[PDB]
Design a protein around this ligand. Structure first.
Ligand SMILES: *C(=O)[C@H]1N[C@@](C)(CO)[C@](O)([C@H](Cc2ccc(F)cc2F)NC(=O)[C@H](Cc2ccc(F)cc2)NC(=O)[C@@H](CC(=O)N(CC)CC)NC(=O)CCCCC)O[C@H]1C
Lengths: 212, 208, 231, 210, 227, 232, 195, 233, 240
């Protein structure tokens, strides 16, 4: 009579561009109505041009990320080249479906840049379904941020339209979205890590959010 | 579960004469029958008979298991098999599936040979669905219609009896029992074995 | 007298060396690797005329982007080929990309030494000349029963493999065109037959760099290559 | 809502693009048709991960069989393989719903496969929440020996009306055409919004009432 | 690693089984007689030094209430065969609720001996059992061999000089022989076989008197019979 | 004479002949050589080339960050051992999030040697491994077909190893407390002594690992520069 | 749900069943072929229940019976076929149940034309006539009324027509289309009926 | 022994157990197979003691499936075992693919099984050479051959058993494409009787079509043996 | 390895060397006869004489019954016979359990020859040194009689003899046997060929044993001839 599933809570935001991908996530761990620590990064770097973020059970995402890094390192050792993001996506799909009947409580986002300098973004469920996207979000705040990303990126139900978008505006939009989620959701967090990927490697910054 | 394919069996003893009888119904969903020939009596040896009452698939499966074991025993020993040995082996088989059992309440009816000439001693016994043997020495009844048969036999049993009177007694007991059960009936057969011969007869029962 | 996995005094395994003896006989085959692709061929050692010659095929495909050429005990070779294509499709399921040829030959060599408990019962007695194309580039590989696999620009297996290697050493040159490679392969193959070269007497396959796809040459392509063949 | 029917110039397959975690849609664009073989497709319904993983597994096994035997597989064999493996996971929680359609040596063939090993051969099928609406509109207006343009128009309108009375179905329509030498994508993806305001509300005045 | 050490030679003959019969022929003899109203198993034990007690070593045993056994060969083989035969009688009685038939037990032990001849990584049993018993179908007497083949006898002898003991027992035997005369013929047969002098604690006897339990005679009863 | 039919039979002198034959297979293998200083372990080896059309075989292999090996003997056995060591280090870093202790890994592979030497119907590996790593100190280990392992300042495997060993013990004192460049140079002198018939960029392998220096094979241009320095 | 009807007499046997592929509240088809399973020789197996259960069980039983006939080079007896099917169904009932009804029929030289009823719990017995499903209630008494000894095939088909008319008129699932399977004079004739 | 290698490479690089299986095949009785257009003819010899042996119990020539057929030469018990294995695999394929097993798949599976027993411990090679006849998935007649080594190939005509080289030499100089049924039966009966005593009782010939395998009656065989006996003399 | 017997391993000629020695063991055994008759099928045999104190009553050591409709005659080692008799009975009752009809004899002999072939091929265990003359009745094929061997080969025979002096017995069967014949004529011919094989002018009643199987009254039953019946048969043989 013990349920092996708890929502530690959080949110991971993802957004793409012509030759870059922006992924952002909280740095809060928690329980139902109480917080463990104010610093628990959910984003794990996988390759030089790929990262993975998640939300749900902390132990499951840690085990999944370390297992995926093990498989990637074994792949590089056996095959003498780094795996592409599509390869990692299919591998994570097979890993998730292996535990179909005791699934991981982990809603994953897989970001990176393809060999042709295209910022990809795959979004997952608990079991293994995955589809490429230009915008996605998972976790507790997913219902909050996802309409906003639909308004900004897809920009349907509009007539004037504006597709002129660049890296700084996309980053600032992600900061606005995660701040709005922090105001409007209790599990979100207090400090967030804005991972940015470009052809010239990876950069990571940090931002301070509300502590409530 | 025994309402699904309700059935009844019966067996009496007498003076160098033994009888066994059964109903010929096969049920489905309790209150609708599908056949009027499903005999619960199965011949197994020249002087041993067995009456299986309960679920029809378990009746048939237990019949083939016991036939396998029996015919193995006569073929290896090269001699006819005894009623007590068959009864003990039947009790062991029913116990061997103590959990998830065969839903069947069988009986055993036959003759006991005492060589010296030879004397044929009657033998009758009954079982639960596990093999709770109990020697009885007179009328033995088993099935959903068991209570009615117990009521009939004590009024109608006359200790040792002639084979004709035994046939009348067992026939009237079975027919009066089956008339008072809705899910049991649809004809009957009465097998009256003796050392000289066996008489098999079917009764003009309330089969409707 | 002795077990399968008994070392010799010189440190060589007896069964492995005897398996190396078995590959010395068989159908001759030749492989060439160039920038534009890879080529394989076989002498097509035809039996009596009552054979169809379609069922007797020496150039199978591990995958869409890999070919092969067999030598030695052929049933053992088909077993190795079957395991190889199964593992390559397993890679294609687990990973979207096409498997590199190096990993395929490594898995084949891993199965070949399965008889040494460290299941099968003896060495396979097969030499393979695997060729394919991947993102790293076109290449071909050599396999033998001892498990060591070495990677080539041009090689040969079978009966007349020594003379084929000598002619390839004399004639092969780097920065070659694919047509030059085809005519070179047919010249070497023709020189090492017993019978005269013809259309049904030879079979060819190739995997282009652009197509990245296995493609066995038919009778028309073989006749076209033979007609422009110097003599 | 998936769709498949058979006509003179082969088979037309149509699907939606919605994806629901319950009352909330996960993604509005997806791909519910997988090239299992060069000459065979298969729709997707029910549990997304289950159907996706099992058609990819079936495509793997088909590549094994074709590469060994050097002969293209039939749709009946792939459907039988799928129904056999799905029956092994009976009573476990799978909700795979599949319509397999393609050309083989026998001819144009079409099969329906479910999580319960429900292999059924036919010429018209549809699985999903909006299956009934598509079935109704086709069986009102499906005929053999009609043109390809009429077929794509019929499939598009059926998918539209299935989306119209089904919140679960929506997004975009993807109508594919199967013929002898493989297949072509007639409609890669087309929004249902302009489809509605062309079909049912051609004049953009007042809310449509029903 | 499991392979048959026993194998067919040219002309067959099962050389290991022949060596097992050679073991039996050199081992201390045993015999049994089937009478009109009883069956006997008897055997001589070697003239013991004073430190041995016959109340510990027993070549005569009982498998059931009515069934006895005697052997001639290796003792440990006889011990394991006796224990497993007891298990066979017990499982038959558990199933069918009766004392085991002699024929069924003989068939099972013969099958076990054949299994040990056939099974890899083992050697045949170096003895020859002699089972006697009473059941519904009269009295019986059987003889197991290392080959795993059983023979139905009315009177037989095993061990050293078994041909001469067979001839002597054939000379003095009748189908309608009484049980006491059968015991006397057993004593005379073993006396001719030993080529020495006999007494209590040098011989051992087992007998089944009619439909009664199988009985092993004490030294007092044997001393009474010797007089 | 007759005590070399199986690997489970001691001779009258008390020697396993099969294990000695596996060591003989190692000794007939291609060359290799390793050197360490104070904060660097350099590894080099002669890559086998059977024909001018054949390309050089892989000699040096990478196992984990800051760990690597070199090969001499049966190559399939080396493949098995490499897969085992790679799985062990990656599993350790999985379950514990730290680099594995190198000598524990060496004991693990030596145990794998032992269990195959010991039980019948199995053979010892015909390969010895030249393990080099930096687990907070440069280190060079060795494995043999019998379950056994020793630690070295410098080592060589098979081929004309006598010339290399003579050069190494002639110059062992200067290896400690010298820079990385001279260390690479000395390793190349040892391999050139093993040649006895010229060293080129294609036919030689070279790897470096040390403090703030993960395991990385030397590029073609740098290796050509060092080879030209050796020639001069 | 799935109606199966069967009749047997002197020198004929008839089987019948509706042609419907039900999924949820609709029909995948009106011309189902998953219920009948022709066996090599004068034999047949008619199944009713869930589609996948009858598919797996019928193919398994058919292809094992074919294996027996090919290995042994003789036609399997009808009684052996029926009891083998019952034993397989009972074994699978105890472990991995197949909710599927049965109607085994065939012709044998030694037993003649004969039929066997069998339920989803392997409740098997020989009968001259029987039925399955909820439609068994509305057609079995007709079969009692109009069956008599020395019947003919045409009279049997008239009885089946009466049963189909009753199932169309009165049974909740007004089943229109049916498929028949007649065995007589060493032939196996199939018919399709639409009342 | 249990689970150890008994077939191994000789010093010359040959698996001597496989050649011993080939001599076991060569001692076994002869068999012939022909195909043309849309049918095939199968012939095997026969040897019986007159007045004692029952010819019906012989199963040299058999049927595996609705369409596939098989003939063999070697140890009959091993043939029966592998025949039961192939029939099991035929019905296993027909339950997992819902199409009848083509001849190419069964020939490949027989070769795979014979290589498996040749390449595993605790089992000696199947001492039989089979040749399978059947229809491909595209309704094309093709007859396959199979050796104990696991070698298989498709032939228009080929023979096995005693004196197979002589029969194969005869068939090379007499085979024609798209012959009549009577012509194929005539050619097979000539070919088998090159190395077999001339009598009707020493053969069991049959003809395979898409309908079923049909064994030729004794009267037609008697006419055929009489006709070729006249032709030789 | 060093102590291996080389059982499952081909000869240079392809014979395995082990079934051959088994067959030489068969040829040294007591002779057994087989005959098919219009009324039945007969499996007469010859007892090996161990001692006069063997129980003459019953003790049928050569002929055994597998079922009410199947019975066979042993021509080799008795233990290897009896274990296979038990396997045969198990297979018969298993088929009756599975299918609820009697097993045809062809199926049964296929099963025994398959299990004998297994130890000839799989493992390193010796083969069974026994050859049977299995006979019985079925509705599919009627009275049949077969000849099994350690190789796993079986073949149908209308009449045959195996064991020692099988050549002379088979010659007598070829000379005397007829297609349609009575049970008494078959029994007399069985005595004749047993006497010819045993090198005796007149057969001894104690030295032989007979059995027959007839489908009388639609219920097959086996009879095993006693000493008095064999004495009457030998009296008729001397009269004839
Ligand atoms: C037509 O009628 C149409 N209806 C819908 C859209 C209704 O949901 C669906 O059934 C759809 C299938 C689908 C979706 C995406 C995709 F890429 C492929 C695909 F085939 N069904 C669903 O999406 C699942 C609903 C469901 C139905 C039956 C069940 F028994 C269980 C669930 N929802 C999902 O698969 C969801 C998570 C999931 O796996 N669940 C629900 C918690 C079951 C464990 N995954 C996604 O939505 C996509 C990944 C997340 C993207 C961020 O298709 C046709 C029939």
């Amino acid at each position: 009579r013990w349920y092996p599933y708890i929502d530690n809570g959080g949110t991971v935001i993802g957004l793409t561009g012509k030759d870059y991908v922006i992924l952002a996530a909280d740095t809060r761990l928690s329980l139902s109505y109480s917080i463990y620590t104010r610093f628990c990064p959910k984003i794990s770097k996988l390759t030089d041009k790929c990262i993975i973020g998640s939300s749900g059970m902390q132990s499951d995402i840690k085990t999944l990320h370390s297992l995926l890094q093990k498989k990637i390192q074994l792949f590089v050792l056996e095959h003498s080249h780094y795996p592409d993001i599509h390869v990692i996506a299919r591998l994570l799909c097979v890993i998730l479906y292996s535990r179909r009947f005791f699934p991981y409580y982990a809603f994953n986002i897989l970001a990176g840049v393809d060999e042709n300098n295209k910022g990809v973004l795959y979004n997952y469920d608990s079991v293994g379904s995955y589809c490429e996207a230009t915008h996605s979000c998972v976790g507790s705040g997913s219902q909050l941020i996802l309409p906003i990303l639909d308004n900004r990126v897809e920009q349907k139900n509009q007539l004037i339209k504006n597709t002129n978008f660049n890296l700084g505006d996309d980053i600032n939009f992600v900061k606005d979205a995660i701040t709005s989620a922090t105001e409007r959701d209790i599990y979100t967090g207090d400090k967030t890590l804005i991972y940015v990927i470009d052809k010239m490697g990876i950069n990571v910054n940090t931002l301070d959010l509300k502590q409530d | 579960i025994y309402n699904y394919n309700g059935g009844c069996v019966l067996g009496m003893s007498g003076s160098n004469c033994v009888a066994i009888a059964c109903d010929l119904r096969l049920g489905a969903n309790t209150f609708t029958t599908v056949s009027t020939k499903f005999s619960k009596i199965f011949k197994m040896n020249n002087n041993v008979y067995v009456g299986l009452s309960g679920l029809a698939t378990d009746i048939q499966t237990l019949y083939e298991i016991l036939r396998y074991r029996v015919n193995l025993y006569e073929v290896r020993q090269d001699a006819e098999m005894d009623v007590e040995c068959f009864a003990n082996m039947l009790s062991s088989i029913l116990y061997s599936n103590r959990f998830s059992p065969y839903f069947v309440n069988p009986i055993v009816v036959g003759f006991k040979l005492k060589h010296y000439k030879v004397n044929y001693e009657p033998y009758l016994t009954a079982y639960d669905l596990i093999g709770a043997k109990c020697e009885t020495r007179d009328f033995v009844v088993n099935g959903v219609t068991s209570e009615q048969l117990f009521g009939m036999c004590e009024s109608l049993y006359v200790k040792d009896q002639d084979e004709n009177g035994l046939f009348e007694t067992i026939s009237q007991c079975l027919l009066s029992a089956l008339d008072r059960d809705c899910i049991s009936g649809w004809g009957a057969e009465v097998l009256v074995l003796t050392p000289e011969k066996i008489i098999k007869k079917k009764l003009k029962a309330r089969m409707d | 007298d002795r077990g399968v996995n008994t070392f010799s005094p010189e440190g060589r395994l007896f069964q492995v060396e005897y398996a190396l003896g078995a590959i010395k006989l068989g159908s001759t085959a030749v492989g060439i690797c160039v920038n534009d692709g890879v080529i394989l061929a076989s002498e097509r050692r035809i039996s009596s005329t009552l054979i169809e010659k379609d069922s007797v095929e020496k150039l199978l495909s591990i995958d869409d982007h890999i070919g092969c050429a067999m030598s030695g005990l052929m049933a053992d070779a088909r077993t190795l080929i079957d395991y190889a294509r199964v593992e390559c499709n397993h890679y294609k399921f687990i990973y979207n990309e096409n498997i590199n040829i190096k990993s395929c030959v490594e898995l084949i060599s891993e199965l070949a030494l399965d008889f040494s408990n460290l299941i099968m019962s003896r060495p396979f007695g097969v030499a393979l000349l695997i060729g394919g194309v991947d993102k790293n580039g076109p290449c071909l590989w050599y396999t033998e029963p001892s498990g060591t696999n070495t990677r080539f620009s041009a090689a040969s297996i079978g009966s007349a493999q020594e003379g084929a290697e000598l002619l390839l050493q004399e004639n092969y040159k780097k920065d070659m065109t694919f047509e030059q490679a085809e005519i070179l392969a047919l010249t070497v193959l023709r020189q090492v037959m017993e019978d005269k070269l013809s259309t049904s007497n030879v079979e060819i396959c190739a995997i282009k760099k652009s197509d990245q796809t296995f493609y066995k040459y038919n009778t028309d392509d073989i006749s076209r290559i033979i007609d422009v063949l110097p003599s | 809502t998936t769709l498949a029917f058979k006509f003179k110039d082969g088979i037309i397959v149509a699907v939606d693009s919605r994806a629901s975690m319950g009352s909330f849609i996960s993604s509005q664009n997806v791909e519910k048709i997988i090239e299992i073989n060069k000459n065979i497709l298969g729709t997707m319904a029910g549990g997304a991960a289950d159907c996706l993983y099992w058609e990819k597994y079936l495509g793997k096994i088909i590549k094994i069989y074709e590469l060994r035997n050097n002969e293209k597989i039939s749709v009946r064999a792939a459907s039988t393989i799928l129904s056999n493996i799905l029956y092994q996971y009976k009573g476990y929680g799978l909700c795979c719903g599949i319509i397999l359609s393609g050309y083989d040596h026998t001819g144009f063939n079409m099969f329906y496969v479910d999580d319960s090993g429900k292999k059924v051969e036919g010429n018209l099928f549809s699985c999903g929440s909006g299956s009934t609406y598509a079935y109704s509109i086709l069986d009102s207006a499906y005929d053999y020996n009609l043109n390809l343009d009429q077929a794509v128009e019929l499939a598009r309108n059926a998918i539209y009306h299935a989306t119209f009375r089904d919140g679960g179905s929506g997004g975009k329509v993807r109508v594919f055409h199967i013929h002898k030498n493989g297949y072509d994508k007639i409609i890669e993806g087309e929004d249902v919004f302009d489809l509605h305001y062309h079909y049912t509300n051609p004049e953009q005045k007042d809310q449509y009432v029903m | 690693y499991s392979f048959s050490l026993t194998t067919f030679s040219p002309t067959g003959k099962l050389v290991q089984i022949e060596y097992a019969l050679n073991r039996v022929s050199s081992s201390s003899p045993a015999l049994g007689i089937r009478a009109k109203n009883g069956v006997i198993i008897a055997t001589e034990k070697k003239s013991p030094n004073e430190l041995i007690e016959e109340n510990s070593i027993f070549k005569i045993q009982q498998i059931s209430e009515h069934i006895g056994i005697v052997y001639a060969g290796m003792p440990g083989d006889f011990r394991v065969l006796l224990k497993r035969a007891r298990k066979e009688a017990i499982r038959y009685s558990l199933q069918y609720g009766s004392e085991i038939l002699v024929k069924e037990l003989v068939k099972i032990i013969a099958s076990i001996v054949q299994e040990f001849t056939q099974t890899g990584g083992v050697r045949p049993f170096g003895l020859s059992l002699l089972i006697c018993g009473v059941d519904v179908y009269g009295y019986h007497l059987y003889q197991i061999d290392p080959s795993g083949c059983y023979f139905n006898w009315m009177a037989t002898c095993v061990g050293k000089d078994y041909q001469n003991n067979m001839s002597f027992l054939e000379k003095r035997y009748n189908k309608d022989i009484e049980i006491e005369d059968a015991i006397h013929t057993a004593i005379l047969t073993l006396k001719e076989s030993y080529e020495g002098v006999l007494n209590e604690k040098n011989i051992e006897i087992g007998v089944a008197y009619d439909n009664k339990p199988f009985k092993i005679l004490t030294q007092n009863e044997i001393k009474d019979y010797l007089i | 004479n007759l005590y070399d039919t199986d690997n489970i039979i001691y001779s009258p002198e008390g020697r396993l002949y099969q294990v000695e034959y596996a060591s003989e297979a190692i000794k007939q293998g291609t060359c290799a050589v390793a050197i360490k200083s104070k904060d660097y372990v350099v590894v080099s080896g002669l890559k086998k080339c059977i024909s001018k059309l054949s390309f050089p075989q892989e000699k040096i292999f990478k196992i984990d960050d800051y760990i690597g090996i070199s090969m001499s003997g049966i190559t399939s056995d080396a493949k098995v051992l490499t897969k085992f060591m790679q799985n062990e280090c990656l599993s350790h870093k999985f379950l514990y999030n730290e680099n594995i202790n190198i000598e524990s890994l060496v004991r693990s592979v030596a145990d794998k040697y032992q269990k195959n030497t010991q039980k019948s119907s199995k053979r010892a590996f015909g390969v010895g491994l030249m393990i080099a790593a930096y687990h907070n100190e440069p280190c060079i280990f060795e494995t043999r077909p019998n379950g056994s392992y020793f630690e070295y300042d410098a080592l060589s495997f098979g081929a004309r190893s006598h010339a290399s060993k003579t050069y190494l013990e002639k110059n062992l004192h200067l290896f400690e407390e010298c820079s990385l460049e001279e260390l690479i140079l000395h390793c190349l002198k040892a391999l050139k002594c093993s040649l006895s018939s010229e060293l080129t960029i294609s036919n030689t392998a070279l790897a470096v690992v040390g403090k703030n220096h993960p395991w990385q094979e030397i590029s073609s241009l740098q290796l050509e520069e060092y080879l030209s320095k050796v020639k001069m | 749900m799935d109606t199966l009807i069967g009749l047997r007499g002197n020198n004929f046997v008839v089987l019948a069943a509706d042609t419907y592929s039900i999924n949820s509240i609709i029909k995948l088809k009106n011309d189902d072929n998953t219920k009948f399973y022709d066996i090599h020789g004068n034999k047949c197996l008619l199944l009713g229940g869930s589609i996948g259960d009858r598919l797996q069980f019928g193919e398994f039983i058919r292809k094992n019976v074919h294996l027996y006939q090919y290995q042994n080079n003789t036609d399997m007896f009808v009684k052996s076929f029926a009891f083998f099917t019952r034993k397989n169904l009972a074994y699978y009932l105890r472990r991995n149940p197949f909710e599927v009804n049965c109607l085994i029929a065939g012709y044998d030289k030694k037993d003649g034309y004969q039929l066997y009823w069998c339920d989803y719990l392997s409740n098997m017995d020989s009968v001259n006539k029987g039925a399955h499903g909820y439609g068994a209630y509305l057609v079995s008494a007709i079969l009692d009324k109009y069956y008599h000894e020395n019947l003919t095939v045409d009279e049997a088909l008239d009885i089946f027509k009466l049963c189909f008319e009753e199932l169309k008129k009165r049974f909740l699932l007004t089943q229109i289309n049916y498929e028949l399977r007649i065995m007589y004079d060493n032939k196996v004739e199939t018919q399709y009926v639409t009342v | 022994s249990y689970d150890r290698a008994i077939t191994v490479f000789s010093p010359d690089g040959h698996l001597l157990q496989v050649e011993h299986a080939l001599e076991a095949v060569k001692k076994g009785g002869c068999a012939v197979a022909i195909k043309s257009s849309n049918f095939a003819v199968l012939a095997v010899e026969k040897k019986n003691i007159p007045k004692l042996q029952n010819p019906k119990t012989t199963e040299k020539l058999i049927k595996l499936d609705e369409h596939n057929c098989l003939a063999f030469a070697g140890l009959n018990a091993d043939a029966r075992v592998l025949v039961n294995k192939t029939r099991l695999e035929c019905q296993r394929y027909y339950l997992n693919m819902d199409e009848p097993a083509p001849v190419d798949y069964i020939a490949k599976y027989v070769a795979k099984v014979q290589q498996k027993f040749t390449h595993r411990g605790g089992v000696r090679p199947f001492g039989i050479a089979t040749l399978i006849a059947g229809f491909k998935n595209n309704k094309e007649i093709c007859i396959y051959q199979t050796e104990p080594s696991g070698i298989y190939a498709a032939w228009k005509a080929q023979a096995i058993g005693k004196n197979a080289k002589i029969v194969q030499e005869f068939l090379e100089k007499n085979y024609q494409e798209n012959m009549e049924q009577k012509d194929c039966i005539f050619l097979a009966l000539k070919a088998i009787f090159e190395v077999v005593e001339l009598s009707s009782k020493n053969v069991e010939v049959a003809l395979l079509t898409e309908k079923d395998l049909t064994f030729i009656e004794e009267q037609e065989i008697n006419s055929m043996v009489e006709l070729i006996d006249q032709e030789r003399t | 390895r060093r102590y291996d017997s080389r059982t499952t391993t081909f000869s240079p000629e392809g014979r395995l060397y082990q079934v051959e020695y088994a067959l030489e063991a068969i040829n040294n055994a007591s002779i057994t006869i087989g005959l098919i008759t219009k009324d039945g099928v007969i499996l007469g045999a010859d007892k090996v004489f161990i001692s006069k104190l063997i129980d003459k009553a019953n003790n049928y050591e050569k002929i055994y019954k597998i079922d009410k409709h199947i019975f066979c005659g042993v021509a080799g080692l008795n233990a290897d016979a009896n274990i296979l008799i038990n396997q045969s009975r198990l297979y018969a009752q298993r088929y009756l359990y599975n299918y609820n009809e009697v097993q045809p004899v062809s199926q049964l002999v296929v099963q025994i020859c398959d299990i004998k072939q297994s130890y000839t091929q799989y493992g390193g265990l010796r083969p069974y040194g026994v050859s049977f003359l299995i006979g019985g009745y079925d509705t599919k094929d009627g009275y049949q009689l077969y000849h099994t061997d350690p190789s796993g080969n079986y073949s149908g025979w209308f009449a045959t003899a195996i064991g020692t002096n099988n050549l002379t017995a088979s010659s007598v069967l070829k000379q005397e046997w007829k297609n349609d014949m009575t049970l008494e004529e078959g029994l007399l011919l069985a005595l004749k060929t047993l006497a010819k094989s045993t090198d005796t002018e007149i057969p001894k009643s104690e030295k032989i044993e007979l059995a027959y199987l007839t489908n009388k009254d639609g219920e097959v039953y086996q009879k095993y001839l006693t000493e008095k019946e064999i004495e009457e048969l030998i009296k008729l043989y001397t009269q004839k």
